[PDB]
Amino acid sequence: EDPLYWGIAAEAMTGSHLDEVKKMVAEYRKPVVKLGGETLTISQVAAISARDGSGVTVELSEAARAGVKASSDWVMDSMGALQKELIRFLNAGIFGNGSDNTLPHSATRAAMLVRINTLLQGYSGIRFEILEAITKFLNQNITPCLPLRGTITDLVPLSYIAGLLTGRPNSKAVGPTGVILSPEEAFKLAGVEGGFFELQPKEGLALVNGTAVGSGMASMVLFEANILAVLAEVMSAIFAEVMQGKPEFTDHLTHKLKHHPGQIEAAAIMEHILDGSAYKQDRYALRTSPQWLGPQIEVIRSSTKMIEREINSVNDNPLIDVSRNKAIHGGNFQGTPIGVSMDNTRLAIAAIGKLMFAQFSELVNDFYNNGLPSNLSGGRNPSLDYGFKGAEVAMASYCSELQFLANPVTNHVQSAEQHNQDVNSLGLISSRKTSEAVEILKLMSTTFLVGLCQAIDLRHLEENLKSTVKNTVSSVAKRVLTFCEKDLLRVVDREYIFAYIDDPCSATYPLMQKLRQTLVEHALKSIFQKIATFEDELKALLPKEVESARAALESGNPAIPNRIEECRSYPLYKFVRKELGTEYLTGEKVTSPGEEFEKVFIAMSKGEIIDPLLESLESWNGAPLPI
Amino acid sequence: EDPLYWGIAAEAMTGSHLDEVKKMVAEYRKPVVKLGGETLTISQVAAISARDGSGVTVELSEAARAGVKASSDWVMDSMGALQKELIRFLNAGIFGNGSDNTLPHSATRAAMLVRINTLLQGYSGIRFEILEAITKFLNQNITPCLPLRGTITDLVPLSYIAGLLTGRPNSKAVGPTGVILSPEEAFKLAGVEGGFFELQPKEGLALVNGTAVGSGMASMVLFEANILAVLAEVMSAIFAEVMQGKPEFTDHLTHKLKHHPGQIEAAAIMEHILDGSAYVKQDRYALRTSPQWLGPQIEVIRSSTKMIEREINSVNDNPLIDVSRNKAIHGGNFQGTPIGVSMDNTRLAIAAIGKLMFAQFSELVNDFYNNGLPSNLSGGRNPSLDYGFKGAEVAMASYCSELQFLANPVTNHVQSAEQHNQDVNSLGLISSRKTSEAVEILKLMSTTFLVGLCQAIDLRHLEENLKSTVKNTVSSVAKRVLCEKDLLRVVDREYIFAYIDDPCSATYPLMQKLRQTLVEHALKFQKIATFEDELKALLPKEVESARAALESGNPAIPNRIEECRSYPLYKFVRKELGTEYLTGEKVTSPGEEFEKVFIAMSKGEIIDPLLESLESWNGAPLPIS
Amino acid sequence: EDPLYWGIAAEAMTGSHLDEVKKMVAEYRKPVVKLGGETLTISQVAAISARDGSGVTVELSEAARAGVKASSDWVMDSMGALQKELIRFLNAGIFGNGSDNTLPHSATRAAMLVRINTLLQGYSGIRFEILEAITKFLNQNITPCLPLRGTITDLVPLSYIAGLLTGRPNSKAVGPTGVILSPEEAFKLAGVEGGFFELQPKEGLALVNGTAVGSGMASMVLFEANILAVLAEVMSAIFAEVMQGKPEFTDHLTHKLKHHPGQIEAAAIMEHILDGSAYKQDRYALRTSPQWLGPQIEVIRSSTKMIEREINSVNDNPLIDVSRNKAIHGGNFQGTPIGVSMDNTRLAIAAIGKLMFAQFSELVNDFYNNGLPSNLSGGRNPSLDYGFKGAEVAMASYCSELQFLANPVTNHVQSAEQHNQDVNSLGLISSRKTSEAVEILKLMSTTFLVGLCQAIDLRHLEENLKSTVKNTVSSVAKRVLTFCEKDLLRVVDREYIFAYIDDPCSATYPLMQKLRQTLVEHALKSIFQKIATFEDELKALLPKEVESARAALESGNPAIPNRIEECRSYPLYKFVRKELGTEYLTGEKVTSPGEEFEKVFIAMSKGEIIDPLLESLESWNGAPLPI
Ligand SMILES: COc1ccc(/C=C/C(=O)O)cc1
């Protein structure tokens, strides 16, 4: 039914993207990664790549040993300085001093995990003992030092894993605390039984022939990319809340009629956030965000399945086919799936960043943000509070560099190795630039998320102070003006609080101006003789009441509670504010926006945003609201 | 008659690029960098950016004190909390954990230096005392911690220099040994007296409104780029030396007739190396066209240098305080377009230089194109257990591909920023960062190529010695067993490394062309087998003894490189640094040898031997014929 | 003094960039191009490349014949099917059907001119007769058909010039009117004496070995680029006029203190426009335009000198050195100066386009354009006139594609021709993408220039109608209100005309609102009883007077004449409006913005914008105003 395996690949793209992320997070946090050569996922690669003391360990399935020993025994039967030479001349990378030219140790761990899983299928002719030794290195967090560059997708970097296994004099390894270790010391601390391995024929190739380094980092990258995409879907909805945008842009009819599944899910996710919210036309960063993100999600998801197939592949050469009693020469080391997927993912990451920059730009602009103060200024004095103006420039710098990284790597192939490798995938290089793009998207996600929480608090401030103004205006009108008191309060309804609240009784601001106009309108239809009195009484009472209401709110005793507390998006806000301690940014305090950004960005790097994010949708049935 | 200052700029681009590099190096090594707001060079920025204990210090010219105090007093006489707010909201950068999101402290020192120089002209309205404090931080190697990202070209990274000066609670500084310091501790170690500064009006803008970070690092990059450009020129000649290429490709007529000065100087530099080569006794484009290829790259790098050298002596403040007319001048000198343009153009030139190195390296290691050198430049007796630079060649392609990727520009990704008030911005520092990345990758290719050239040199030394050996014993077997004039001609023509691993191998040419040779003279046969039996019994012994003698340091014919003008770089790599001839019969790997050169290169130790290769050059091409 | 020729190259970068453009335009329009092998300029290449019947002809200097015959005679003395073979196998281009794969005929003419000038030096060993034959083809406008692609910088395209000279059966040529011609017909119509040439040794190489095609189109490109740069400098100043921006951004102190000569000239040019103008803080597209354009001009100018040296070079191989009696083998065919200069110019063209898009965006936005109507709407009814809204989207599409073309071509080199050409410059390809970028910049220049003229007329309308409102308001106040009449007119001074003029007496617009406020302010200090009367009289008179004033202006009889008539920028406006007939775009007429854009864009393609542009600066002394 499925001779070319199109069908089984299609079966993996069914279900919602969120569910995959939910499952992805679930198996990431499982305590044991069992390698059988067929079931490795990017979440398991990521979980192992972490050096945060999670406790995760790697186990090799004994069901695969028989196949591994068979191909190994086959090579010995068909038959050692050639293996020593292979590792020597491939040690051609450059470390220099420092870590700027060394592969990140978490990326080395990813490569080590993938390198094992791609050798368990049993077609590589390498001793199971070597696969067990690399597992000890992972479990005891003993990482060999690999060069950052030197591969076109990974003879050179992988040879530094073989160099540690064979006890090369130049081989170095890092301990759990950053200590430089010699090969002997590395073996002693990892518990590798016996001494250094004397590589048998084909064992050298089995270790260096393969795409594990590129595919390993691509797995780490795509794990973070799948989270950040969902985080982009939810933040677009939170963005629509504080922007008070028309929620019909999520209506399922609109998206159903495009058939794009990524767009339909994205709109359904946002609809679910807005459907449980207590809060010409809207601009594109808001109204078209489902159309904009849909394809990006479809790309990250499709790219995820490419890598997952790669990390469960046999990418060495030649293939030892015991069943047929012959070695098969091929080109499964050509890591084209890595370069293509990372180039496509990097562009999608940049498209996500562009939308976030566009949304952030709307949020901090009083021309577009529907009443919020310019720069999301939070202080009583807008002239001594410029809020996120500095962050807005940073967002432009983030986005600009993201669009530069969106360019591909795979269109720069060189005819290499005496033109024998006249085509090569550049996979790892692409994974490296896509990792850089994710980290910048994390910078943008940190800044954007803290701004939304600032806007949330400002909406909470708007409602409380708009009520205080109403009460004082009504109290003063009942005193003095006795249809005229009903129209006076409609003015307070229409005017944006943050257009006058820094000085409620300034004759140049719209409150006192439009209040007077309403009185003049009625006088023409003595209401004019009382204007002077009304403005005197209001000038004496309103400033005191506004200040009182703001202090009560700042003191935690608001007259009207923050509506976010009853929003489906509350967990993310609760996480930033309550759990992390991210504080309201105001020009009356010394705390700078960056200091608040550190908290979210650090936690986001520790994966602490996964739970509050998923909790915002945990009651979603995975379907749109009926139309 | 130079009202627009075109001519002053054109006068700067006269003389050779080399002389400019020699002056640039010599100034890098001066023990004192005196700032006057007008004479700052990239070499001075590079020398101060270094945190290597060189001892270089910074002095402020007292002549600029008056102008500085004038604009400072004018502002105060024109009249606080706004200066505290300015630095607060511009502290919008993210550091996280580690140093991945932190500006390298060397780049920070560069920014601090340029920041001082761009305020000494007297048009910024900032107290001289603050400039003196930053100078203490530099000379005491007390560096504030700046974020790597957050600017569109430097209100944000520059605000963290101001954050240190004002004693912000989140402000962090690092000591010479990497120890993190508080703003109070920094002032103590730095020697700054009086405590934190309470910024006066305009002083906040004076500190943060410059282009110092972008321009500061472009100076570091351009310093490295200027040197690597000359290194690429010299190595192209050494490449043409070990390749035995026709030196006719450096004939001045060819390059005189194109007029391009970069191509003329490049052709003339390689001509000087080849004209003084002891090997003196068509080619492919990586060799025959290298001057045409490198010429334009040096012109862009040299042009880009002058752009940045003007930027680091400019006044990028705003507003400018003009006391002579008693008013502030609002403009846009903070627009760092010269940084983004020069860095985009320079990165493309770096990529073109790297592309040439890759093509040359490829020719040098391919036995089809390297004129008798062994495939992969293998140095062992058993080529089946010595693949030489095959792994390095793969790394070169990886270095080259990522460089072509970085060759793309940054300045074509401008976003309409800050509520669309900054609807154009230069992105200079971002471009400086990517060009700096391209530079470090080119250092990887130069290290690998340079060590590869020394390998090729030792392989020509092995070839000549073993060519002489085979000739001799062939004449011995010829005189004793027997013709000779043709048999001896076979040895001179044939490539050593086509048969030397097994000279008398029937499948190899030496023990085949001699048969063909003897049979030819016979046809125009009974003495063949005896001569072969005599040669088979004697040639392995004589070859192994001469090869072992060369390995012990007492070869028959000495290495001709010692009598070449290119010897300084070989002596430095092979003798001074300890780099060793790579061979599969030992366990040392190519990387281990690359490490020695890359580290030395990262510390500037390649500069001296490089310029020494051209010390005797008069700066002009030798005459025609 | 100048052994490496750095000095003589530096001497060519002295003087103002404008002067070079002035000289450039001067020699472009000279009737004869005399080739001596040393003095060819891009303006002469451009003038010859034109097929517009300018009458320009090419003359070969007899001073060069001696050198040409010497090297030719030298080859014959040192010594023919090899020349026949060289041209045959290099005829490997593909034309297909149509012109999408054919080199533009003007680009072929550029290549032909450069190909001659690079063979007149006398080091190429080719018969002077052949150089004379190609000259006939140029003078009689007989152009061989060259393929668009097939060169990495030009064996293949140049071989189709040799194919015409040797009468190849596949060779085709185009006539002055587009007629396809065979080689025989081409010779007959051009007047080439004798039959087809039988190429002697080295003559085939002399024709195909060289960079003429890339350098030829680079010359055409840089001629237009030098004009468009000056046009960008002037339009930034005109932009500042209609924007009513602070002119101190051109103050020479600011730019003198950066030392950047391109910035100093750009600011001095703008200062000169504004210094003779009768017309939070300003934004960057305005205030930093000299900083932004300076480097772009320095790049185009420096790139110009690279190409001019290339078109006067000997780029064939081997070089026949008669003086030394030996042929010199080298690599002057490596067209690196072309690729580098075109890549750098393309980026600068994109930087110019980005600033223009930024400026256009400010101009059409009522939040930023300082009183002009949104979209530069010109009709009485803003709801039926959206002005340049459609053009603003087009500008974004222009700019976006320009930033894509800003990417380089020279970082995509392939190891070619059995890896003998392991490095190559890709010059022509780069020239082709830079030509595409210029044409898009022409689209942006057309649209932006017509918008400025729209804004000019709107400023003329603003002044006339603001005066009409003043007179009616004063006439009504003198009637009814008799310090109060002086404050009423100050309101008219402060309010932007186009914020209310479409309905001057709407109670929801700011005119009637802020007029009433001023009356109420005075009444509180009976002035209140007369408000109703004042608004009745104004409602009856003001609409009639506004309409009368607008018709008088539309009828050519404005009460106040258009201040542009006395501006140094008047020529460009006079050219667009008067000479070309570009009409005021108003939603009350059927004419669309594109129709007006055709006129300017067509004329700009015919070089008709050079004179009005230069006339705006013809009285500039080439120095900044004293500080
Ligand atoms: C991002 O925060 C900012 C933005 C703008 C400025 C002033 C700029 C000028 O003087 O033209 C200062 C700080």
Short mmCIF file of C-alpha atoms in Angstrom, two decimals, chain B residues 2-7 9-11 13-17 37 121 123 155 211 248-249 251-265 268 282-289 292-300 302-303 306-308 310-311 313-316 318 320-322 324-325 327-338 340-341 344-345 348 351-352 355-356 359-360 363 369 403-405 407-409 411-416 418-426 617-621 624-625, chain C residues 2-7 9-11 13-17 37 121 123 211 248-249 251-265 268 281-288 291-299 301-302 305-310 312-315 317-321 324 326-337 339-340 343-344 347 350-351 354-355 358-359 362 368 403-404 406-415 417-425 620-624 626-627:
data_model
loop_
_atom_site.label_atom_id
_atom_site.label_comp_id
_atom_site.label_asym_id
_atom_site.label_seq_id
_atom_site.Cartn_x
_atom_site.Cartn_y
_atom_site.Cartn_z
CA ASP B 2 38.62 71.66 -1.53
CA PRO B 3 35.40 73.04 0.00
CA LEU B 4 33.63 69.66 0.25
CA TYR B 5 36.73 67.79 1.53
CA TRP B 6 36.91 65.32 -1.37
CA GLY B 7 40.59 66.14 -1.91
CA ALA B 9 40.05 62.13 1.39
CA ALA B 10 41.79 61.47 -1.93
CA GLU B 11 45.14 62.51 -0.47
CA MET B 13 44.50 57.05 -0.50
CA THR B 14 47.96 57.73 -1.95
CA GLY B 15 51.00 55.52 -1.48
CA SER B 16 51.06 51.75 -1.33
CA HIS B 17 48.66 49.65 0.71
CA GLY B 37 39.57 64.11 18.72
CA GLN B 121 36.26 68.26 19.68
CA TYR B 123 30.85 70.26 20.39
CA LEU B 155 21.68 54.47 22.77
CA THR B 211 28.32 55.42 16.90
CA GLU B 248 55.20 35.39 -15.92
CA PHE B 249 51.75 36.00 -14.39
CA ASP B 251 54.70 40.73 -15.32
CA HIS B 252 54.04 44.41 -14.71
CA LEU B 253 52.88 45.03 -18.29
CA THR B 254 49.79 42.86 -17.83
CA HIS B 255 48.82 44.82 -14.71
CA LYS B 256 50.02 48.24 -15.89
CA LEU B 257 47.52 47.90 -18.74
CA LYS B 258 44.53 47.44 -16.41
CA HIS B 259 45.45 50.52 -14.32
CA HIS B 260 43.77 49.12 -11.19
CA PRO B 261 46.15 50.04 -8.33
CA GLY B 262 45.19 47.15 -6.04
CA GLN B 263 45.96 44.68 -8.83
CA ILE B 264 49.23 46.48 -9.60
CA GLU B 265 50.46 46.38 -6.00
CA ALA B 268 54.19 43.66 -7.62
CA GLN B 282 48.89 27.06 -18.47
CA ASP B 283 48.45 27.66 -14.76
CA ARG B 284 44.94 27.69 -13.34
CA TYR B 285 43.07 30.81 -12.29
CA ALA B 286 43.59 30.52 -8.53
CA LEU B 287 47.26 31.14 -9.42
CA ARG B 288 47.50 32.98 -12.75
CA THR B 289 44.73 35.50 -11.93
CA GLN B 292 43.29 40.50 -10.61
CA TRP B 293 41.22 38.77 -7.92
CA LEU B 294 42.85 40.28 -4.82
CA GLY B 295 43.34 43.76 -6.28
CA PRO B 296 39.76 44.98 -5.91
CA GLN B 297 39.44 43.38 -2.47
CA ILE B 298 42.33 45.45 -1.11
CA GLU B 299 40.88 48.63 -2.63
CA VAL B 300 37.55 48.01 -0.88
CA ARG B 302 41.51 50.25 2.11
CA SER B 303 38.60 52.49 1.12
CA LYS B 306 39.38 55.52 5.61
CA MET B 307 35.60 55.67 6.00
CA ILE B 308 35.87 54.23 9.52
CA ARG B 310 36.82 59.40 9.59
CA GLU B 311 33.93 58.04 11.66
CA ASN B 313 37.25 61.13 14.57
CA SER B 314 33.76 62.48 13.80
CA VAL B 315 31.24 64.13 16.10
CA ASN B 316 28.28 61.74 16.11
CA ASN B 318 23.32 65.39 18.87
CA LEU B 320 25.94 69.86 18.60
CA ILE B 321 26.94 72.75 20.86
CA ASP B 322 28.35 75.59 18.72
CA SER B 324 30.82 80.44 18.27
CA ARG B 325 27.20 80.98 17.19
CA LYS B 327 23.08 77.83 19.75
CA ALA B 328 22.65 74.07 19.50
CA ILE B 329 22.66 72.45 16.05
CA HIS B 330 20.25 69.54 15.61
CA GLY B 331 21.27 67.01 12.96
CA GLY B 332 21.79 63.31 12.42
CA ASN B 333 25.49 62.50 12.73
CA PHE B 334 24.46 59.49 14.84
CA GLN B 335 23.33 57.79 11.60
CA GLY B 336 26.15 55.26 11.28
CA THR B 337 25.70 54.60 7.56
CA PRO B 338 29.51 54.70 7.01
CA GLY B 340 27.18 49.53 7.78
CA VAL B 341 28.31 50.30 4.23
CA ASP B 344 29.04 45.09 4.26
CA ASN B 345 31.53 45.89 1.48
CA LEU B 348 32.12 40.66 0.74
CA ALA B 351 34.61 36.35 1.36
CA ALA B 352 36.28 36.88 -2.02
CA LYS B 355 37.20 31.99 -1.94
CA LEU B 356 40.64 32.43 -3.52
CA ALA B 359 40.65 27.47 -4.72
CA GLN B 360 44.41 27.70 -4.18
CA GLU B 363 44.96 23.07 -6.36
CA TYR B 369 47.14 20.20 -10.55
CA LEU B 403 32.07 32.79 4.49
CA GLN B 404 30.04 33.11 1.28
CA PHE B 405 26.94 32.98 3.49
CA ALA B 407 29.11 37.74 2.49
CA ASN B 408 25.47 38.85 2.35
CA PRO B 409 24.83 42.42 3.56
CA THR B 411 22.24 47.10 5.69
CA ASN B 412 19.49 45.85 3.34
CA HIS B 413 17.38 44.67 6.32
CA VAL B 414 16.57 48.06 7.83
CA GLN B 415 13.29 48.27 9.75
CA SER B 416 11.24 51.41 10.37
CA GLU B 418 11.17 53.64 17.21
CA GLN B 419 7.57 54.44 16.30
CA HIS B 420 8.90 55.10 12.78
CA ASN B 421 11.03 58.05 13.89
CA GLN B 422 14.07 56.01 12.82
CA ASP B 423 12.63 54.97 9.46
CA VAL B 424 16.23 54.50 8.28
CA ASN B 425 19.14 53.16 10.34
CA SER B 426 22.57 51.82 9.46
CA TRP B 617 60.90 45.69 -1.53
CA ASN B 618 61.22 49.27 -2.77
CA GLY B 619 57.45 49.59 -3.20
CA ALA B 620 57.55 49.54 -7.01
CA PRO B 621 57.47 46.84 -9.69
CA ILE B 624 60.01 45.39 -17.91
CA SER B 625 62.26 42.46 -18.84
CA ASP C 2 53.40 56.94 -8.17
CA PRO C 3 54.87 53.54 -9.09
CA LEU C 4 51.75 51.53 -8.20
CA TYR C 5 49.31 54.11 -9.65
CA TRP C 6 47.53 54.74 -6.35
CA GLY C 7 48.29 58.43 -6.81
CA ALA C 9 43.65 56.96 -9.13
CA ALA C 10 43.36 59.28 -6.12
CA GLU C 11 43.67 62.33 -8.38
CA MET C 13 38.44 61.34 -6.95
CA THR C 14 39.04 65.07 -6.42
CA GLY C 15 36.37 67.66 -7.12
CA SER C 16 32.68 67.47 -6.32
CA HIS C 17 30.55 64.52 -7.38
CA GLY C 37 42.24 53.06 -26.14
CA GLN C 121 46.15 49.79 -27.17
CA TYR C 123 48.82 44.52 -27.36
CA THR C 211 35.35 41.59 -20.01
CA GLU C 248 19.47 73.22 10.08
CA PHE C 249 19.99 69.52 9.29
CA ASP C 251 24.21 73.09 8.43
CA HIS C 252 27.78 72.56 7.31
CA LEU C 253 29.11 72.35 10.88
CA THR C 254 27.29 69.07 11.47
CA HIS C 255 28.69 67.45 8.33
CA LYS C 256 32.10 69.14 8.36
CA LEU C 257 32.65 67.45 11.73
CA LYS C 258 32.19 64.01 10.13
CA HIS C 259 34.70 64.68 7.31
CA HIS C 260 32.79 62.29 5.03
CA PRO C 261 33.03 64.13 1.68
CA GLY C 262 29.94 62.46 0.21
CA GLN C 263 27.93 63.53 3.24
CA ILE C 264 29.31 67.07 3.09
CA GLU C 265 28.44 67.47 -0.60
CA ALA C 268 25.67 71.30 0.78
CA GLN C 281 11.99 67.16 15.79
CA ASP C 282 12.30 65.89 12.22
CA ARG C 283 12.49 62.16 11.57
CA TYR C 284 15.46 60.31 10.12
CA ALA C 285 14.40 60.02 6.48
CA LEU C 286 14.66 63.84 6.53
CA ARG C 287 17.18 64.81 9.21
CA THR C 288 19.79 62.13 8.44
CA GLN C 291 24.46 60.98 6.41
CA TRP C 292 22.51 58.25 4.63
CA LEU C 293 23.34 59.22 1.04
CA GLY C 294 26.96 60.30 1.51
CA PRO C 295 28.43 56.79 1.58
CA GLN C 296 26.12 55.65 -1.23
CA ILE C 297 27.48 58.45 -3.42
CA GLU C 298 31.06 57.68 -2.38
CA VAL C 299 30.40 54.08 -3.45
CA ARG C 301 31.67 57.37 -7.55
CA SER C 302 34.42 54.94 -6.53
CA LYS C 305 36.38 54.81 -11.53
CA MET C 306 36.81 51.03 -11.31
CA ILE C 307 34.74 50.44 -14.45
CA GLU C 308 36.25 53.36 -16.37
CA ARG C 309 39.67 51.78 -15.79
CA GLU C 310 38.27 48.42 -16.93
CA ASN C 312 40.27 51.30 -20.96
CA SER C 313 42.18 48.11 -20.12
CA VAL C 314 43.68 45.27 -22.14
CA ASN C 315 41.62 42.32 -20.89
CA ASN C 317 45.32 37.05 -23.28
CA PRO C 318 48.13 36.51 -24.18
CA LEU C 319 49.49 40.07 -24.43
CA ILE C 320 51.61 40.62 -27.54
CA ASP C 321 54.59 42.69 -26.35
CA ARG C 324 60.08 42.52 -26.00
CA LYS C 326 57.31 37.69 -26.71
CA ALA C 327 53.68 36.97 -25.87
CA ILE C 328 52.76 37.51 -22.22
CA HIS C 329 50.34 35.06 -20.60
CA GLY C 330 48.26 36.41 -17.75
CA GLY C 331 44.78 36.82 -16.39
CA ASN C 332 43.46 40.26 -17.31
CA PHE C 333 40.25 38.55 -18.47
CA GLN C 334 39.37 38.00 -14.78
CA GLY C 335 36.67 40.64 -14.44
CA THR C 336 36.81 40.96 -10.66
CA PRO C 337 36.58 44.79 -10.79
CA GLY C 339 31.60 42.04 -10.00
CA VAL C 340 32.91 43.89 -6.93
CA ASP C 343 27.73 44.24 -6.06
CA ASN C 344 28.75 47.34 -4.08
CA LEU C 347 23.67 47.68 -2.32
CA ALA C 350 19.09 49.70 -2.43
CA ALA C 351 20.15 52.06 0.37
CA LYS C 354 15.19 52.56 1.27
CA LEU C 355 15.59 56.25 2.10
CA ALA C 358 11.08 56.11 4.08
CA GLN C 359 10.68 59.68 2.80
CA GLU C 362 6.45 60.27 5.77
CA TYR C 368 4.16 63.02 10.04
CA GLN C 403 16.49 44.94 -0.86
CA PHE C 404 16.38 41.44 -2.35
CA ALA C 406 20.99 44.20 -2.84
CA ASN C 407 22.40 40.73 -2.16
CA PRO C 408 25.72 40.05 -3.93
CA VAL C 409 26.41 37.85 -6.93
CA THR C 410 30.15 37.45 -6.42
CA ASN C 411 29.77 35.14 -3.40
CA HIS C 412 28.30 32.42 -5.65
CA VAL C 413 31.41 31.52 -7.64
CA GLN C 414 31.67 27.97 -9.00
CA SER C 415 34.85 26.06 -9.81
CA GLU C 417 35.74 24.69 -16.83
CA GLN C 418 37.19 21.45 -15.49
CA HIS C 419 38.20 23.53 -12.45
CA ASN C 420 40.64 25.58 -14.53
CA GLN C 421 38.48 28.63 -13.81
CA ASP C 422 38.30 27.80 -10.11
CA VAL C 423 37.73 31.53 -9.50
CA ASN C 424 35.62 33.83 -11.67
CA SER C 425 34.07 37.24 -11.14
CA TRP C 620 25.69 76.55 -6.75
CA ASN C 621 29.31 77.57 -6.15
CA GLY C 622 30.17 74.00 -5.13
CA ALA C 623 30.83 75.02 -1.52
CA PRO C 624 28.74 75.08 1.67
CA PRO C 626 29.75 79.73 5.79
CA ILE C 627 29.19 78.71 9.39
#
